[PDB]
Write an enzyme that holds these catalytic residues in place. Structure first.
Site, PDB file in Angstrom:
ATOM      1  N   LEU A   1     -23.772 -35.969 -10.540  1.00 16.32           N
ATOM      2  CA  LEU A   1     -24.459 -36.074  -8.918  1.00 16.32           C
ATOM      3  C   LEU A   1     -26.216 -37.145  -9.670  1.00 16.32           C
ATOM      4  CD1 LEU A   1     -22.669 -33.668  -7.607  1.00 16.32           C
ATOM      5  CD2 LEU A   1     -21.856 -35.897  -7.933  1.00 16.32           C
TER       6      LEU A   1
ATOM      7  N   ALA B   1     -34.775 -30.498 -11.379  1.00 21.24           N
ATOM      8  CA  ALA B   1     -35.732 -30.119 -11.506  1.00 21.24           C
ATOM      9  C   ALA B   1     -35.755 -29.642 -12.855  1.00 21.24           C
ATOM     10  CB  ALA B   1     -36.734 -29.181 -10.608  1.00 21.24           C
ATOM     11  N   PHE B   2     -34.226 -28.814 -12.715  1.00 20.26           N
ATOM     12  CA  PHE B   2     -34.391 -27.174 -13.620  1.00 20.26           C
ATOM     13  C   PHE B   2     -32.884 -27.034 -13.922  1.00 20.26           C
ATOM     14  CE2 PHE B   2     -35.623 -24.340 -10.490  1.00 20.26           C
ATOM     15  CZ  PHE B   2     -34.506 -24.244  -9.387  1.00 20.26           C
ATOM     16  N   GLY B   3     -31.884 -28.006 -14.268  1.00 23.59           N
ATOM     17  CA  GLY B   3     -30.625 -28.362 -13.924  1.00 23.59           C
ATOM     18  C   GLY B   3     -29.660 -29.403 -13.343  1.00 23.59           C
ATOM     19  N   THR B   4     -28.216 -29.634 -13.653  1.00 19.50           N
ATOM     20  CA  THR B   4     -27.629 -31.081 -13.494  1.00 19.50           C
ATOM     21  C   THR B   4     -26.867 -30.086 -12.906  1.00 19.50           C
ATOM     22  OG1 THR B   4     -26.653 -30.886 -15.308  1.00 19.50           O
ATOM     23  CG2 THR B   4     -28.685 -32.375 -15.435  1.00 19.50           C
TER      24      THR B   4
ATOM     25  N   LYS C   1     -23.808 -26.850  -9.819  1.00 16.22           N
ATOM     26  CA  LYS C   1     -25.054 -26.607 -10.971  1.00 16.22           C
ATOM     27  C   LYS C   1     -24.747 -25.412 -11.704  1.00 16.22           C
ATOM     28  CE  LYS C   1     -29.723 -27.824  -8.812  1.00 16.22           C
ATOM     29  NZ  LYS C   1     -31.096 -26.665  -9.302  1.00 16.22           N
TER      30      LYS C   1
ATOM     31  N   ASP D   1     -38.779 -24.684  -2.569  1.00 15.67           N
ATOM     32  CA  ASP D   1     -38.987 -25.858  -3.329  1.00 15.67           C
ATOM     33  C   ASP D   1     -37.890 -26.824  -1.998  1.00 15.67           C
ATOM     34  OD1 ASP D   1     -38.447 -28.018  -4.903  1.00 15.67           O
ATOM     35  OD2 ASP D   1     -36.860 -27.816  -5.367  1.00 15.67           O
TER      36      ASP D   1
HETATM   37  N1  LIG Z   1     -23.067 -30.106  -2.432  1.00 18.49           N
HETATM   38  C1  LIG Z   1     -23.802 -30.439  -3.059  1.00 18.49           C
HETATM   39  N2  LIG Z   1     -23.134 -31.751  -2.359  1.00 18.49           N
HETATM   40  C2  LIG Z   1     -23.364 -33.241  -2.977  1.00 18.49           C
HETATM   41  N3  LIG Z   1     -24.129 -33.059  -3.686  1.00 18.49           N
HETATM   42  C3  LIG Z   1     -25.169 -32.647  -4.272  1.00 18.49           C
HETATM   43  C4  LIG Z   1     -24.428 -30.765  -4.177  1.00 18.49           C
HETATM   44  N4  LIG Z   1     -25.872 -30.294  -4.625  1.00 18.49           N
HETATM   45  C5  LIG Z   1     -26.748 -31.238  -5.150  1.00 18.49           C
HETATM   46  N5  LIG Z   1     -25.891 -32.748  -4.996  1.00 18.49           N
HETATM   47  C6  LIG Z   1     -26.594 -34.300  -5.278  1.00 18.49           C
HETATM   48  O1  LIG Z   1     -26.718 -33.385  -6.537  1.00 18.49           O
HETATM   49  C7  LIG Z   1     -28.135 -33.938  -7.297  1.00 18.49           C
HETATM   50  C8  LIG Z   1     -28.595 -32.279  -8.063  1.00 18.49           C
HETATM   51  O2  LIG Z   1     -30.118 -32.206  -6.924  1.00 18.49           O
HETATM   52  P1  LIG Z   1     -30.526 -30.915  -8.274  1.00 18.49           P
HETATM   53  O3  LIG Z   1     -30.362 -31.124  -9.609  1.00 18.49           O
HETATM   54  O4  LIG Z   1     -31.300 -29.707  -6.515  1.00 18.49           O
HETATM   55  O5  LIG Z   1     -32.052 -32.043  -8.555  1.00 18.49           O
HETATM   56  P2  LIG Z   1     -32.998 -32.354  -7.312  1.00 18.49           P
HETATM   57  O6  LIG Z   1     -32.866 -31.998  -5.783  1.00 18.49           O
HETATM   58  O7  LIG Z   1     -33.352 -34.183  -7.129  1.00 18.49           O
HETATM   59  N6  LIG Z   1     -34.595 -32.110  -7.772  1.00 18.49           N
HETATM   60  P3  LIG Z   1     -34.703 -30.770  -8.439  1.00 18.49           P
HETATM   61  O8  LIG Z   1     -33.762 -28.755  -8.052  1.00 18.49           O
HETATM   62  O9  LIG Z   1     -36.123 -29.543  -7.629  1.00 18.49           O
HETATM   63  O10 LIG Z   1     -34.174 -30.875  -9.930  1.00 18.49           O
HETATM   64  C9  LIG Z   1     -28.974 -33.855  -5.867  1.00 18.49           C
HETATM   65  O11 LIG Z   1     -29.732 -35.240  -6.128  1.00 18.49           O
HETATM   66  C10 LIG Z   1     -28.231 -33.648  -4.571  1.00 18.49           C
HETATM   67  O12 LIG Z   1     -27.711 -35.147  -3.897  1.00 18.49           O
HETATM   68 MG   LIG Z   2     -31.829 -30.357  -5.140  1.00 15.65          MG
END
Ligand SMILES: Nc1ncnc2c1ncn2[C@@H]1O[C@H](COP(=O)(O)OP(=O)(O)NP(=O)(O)O)[C@@H](O)[C@H]1O
Ligand SMILES: [Mg+2]
Length: 302
Positions: free
Chosen positions: A16, A20-23, A43, A134
């Site tokens: 998706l 910042a710290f985890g895909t 996550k 955050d």
């Molecule tokens: N429950 C969810 N449902 C749908 N999309 C999601 C969900 N959780 C996260 N996402 C998407 O997945 C991506 C992963 O975000 P994330 O790994 O948290 O990093 P980030 O939001 O871009 N910034 P960061 O967390 O500080 O590294 C985001 O861009 C969201 O759009």
């Molecule tokens: Mg996020």
């Protein structure tokens, strides 16, 4: 509570985002008691095999956080590779990409409602003595046009470009408090007002530190009223104690929602055709993400 591997499916090909710290990967949750499929977002945190009693303590504490404007954590599972946090998948994506996509058709009522619902969820987190650390529109998810949910909260003890949401006092010493969340809430509202443009665009780090140190703040957007801009300004006080709490901010934006076009100039209003087109776009994203494995009503029935 704790999800086992027998009930979870992690689609490693449906990444998706970065993080910042985890895909984060798309996934399907199979509750063993119920043949129902639940589209979820998984996550992945791989942190030094820190499978300790402290991680379990903060996983269940975060699991008990319940609010309509907080993204519901369906469950958690701790592996040797690391920690997986499972949340309900939202096809509409985060608020940051949502504001840019619907910049021309979102109304003033929707903008004030987002600030209000985000302030509503942060008030619950503050009463629970939880620092988000955050807060930003990228970590706010959109359930529908009139409902947003905060995610990625309570990752303090679990453990960048987020300097744009960083209060002044954090630059000198690391003390993430609720007042620092109020600062990030002010920037988060500024993102909603500006329809998701980048804060301090004509600037960079670490010039933001001295820019904020010289008393300067983000300029009032051309569509923002003066009464609303004073709210962002008092979210950006120099003294951390002079900043209001989310108890105060919740009551402010609720009164702002009564007449939203009195605080923001937005000629557009949501159309009922866009409400039906939004429902068609959610079933499409569900059909494509899981290759027709998820019936769209199963997500709607949830
Ligand atoms: N429950 C969810 N449902 C749908 N999309 C999601 C969900 N959780 C996260 N996402 C998407 O997945 C991506 C992963 O975000 P994330 O790994 O948290 O990093 P980030 O939001 O871009 N910034 P960061 O967390 O500080 O590294 C985001 O861009 C969201 O759009
Ligand atoms: Mg996020």
């Amino acid at each position: 509570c704790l999800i086992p591997s027998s009930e979870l499916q992690t689609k490693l090909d449906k990444k998706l985002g970065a993080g910042a710290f985890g895909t984060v990967f798309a996934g399907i949750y199979y509750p063993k008691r119920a043949n129902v499929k639940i589209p979820v977002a998984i996550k992945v945190f791989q942190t030094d095999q820190s499978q300790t009693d402290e991680m379990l303590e903060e996983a269940t504490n975060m699991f008990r956080l319940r609010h309509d404007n907080l993204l519901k954590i369906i469950g958690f599972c701790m592996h040797d590779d690391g920690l997986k946090i499972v949340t309900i998948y939202r096809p509409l994506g985060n608020l940051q990409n949502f504001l840019k996509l619907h910049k021309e058709n979102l109304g003033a009522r929707e903008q004030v409602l987002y600030c209000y619902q985000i302030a509503s969820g942060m008030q619950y987190l503050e009463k629970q003595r939880v620092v988000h650390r955050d807060l930003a529109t990228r970590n706010v998810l959109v359930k529908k046009f009139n409902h947003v949910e905060i995610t990625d909260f309570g990752l303090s003890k679990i453990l960048k470009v987020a300097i744009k949401w960083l209060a002044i006092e954090i630059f000198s010493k690391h003390c993430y408090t609720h007042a620092s969340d109020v600062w990030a809430f002010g920037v988060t509202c500024w993102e909603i007002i500006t329809f998701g443009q980048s804060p301090y665009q004509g600037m960079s780090t670490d010039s933001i530190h001295n820019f904020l140190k010289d008393g300067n703040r983000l300029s009032q957007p051309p569509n923002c009223s003066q009464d609303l801009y004073q709210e962002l300004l008092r979210c950006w006080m120099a003294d951390p104690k002079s900043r209001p709490g989310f108890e105060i901010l919740y009551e402010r934006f609720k009164e702002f929602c009564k007449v939203p076009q009195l605080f923001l100039e937005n000629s557009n209003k949501i159309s009922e055709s866009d409400l039906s087109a939004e429902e068609r776009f959610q079933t499409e994203r569900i059909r494509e993400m899981f290759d027709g494995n998820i019936d769209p009503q199963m997500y709607f029935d949830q």
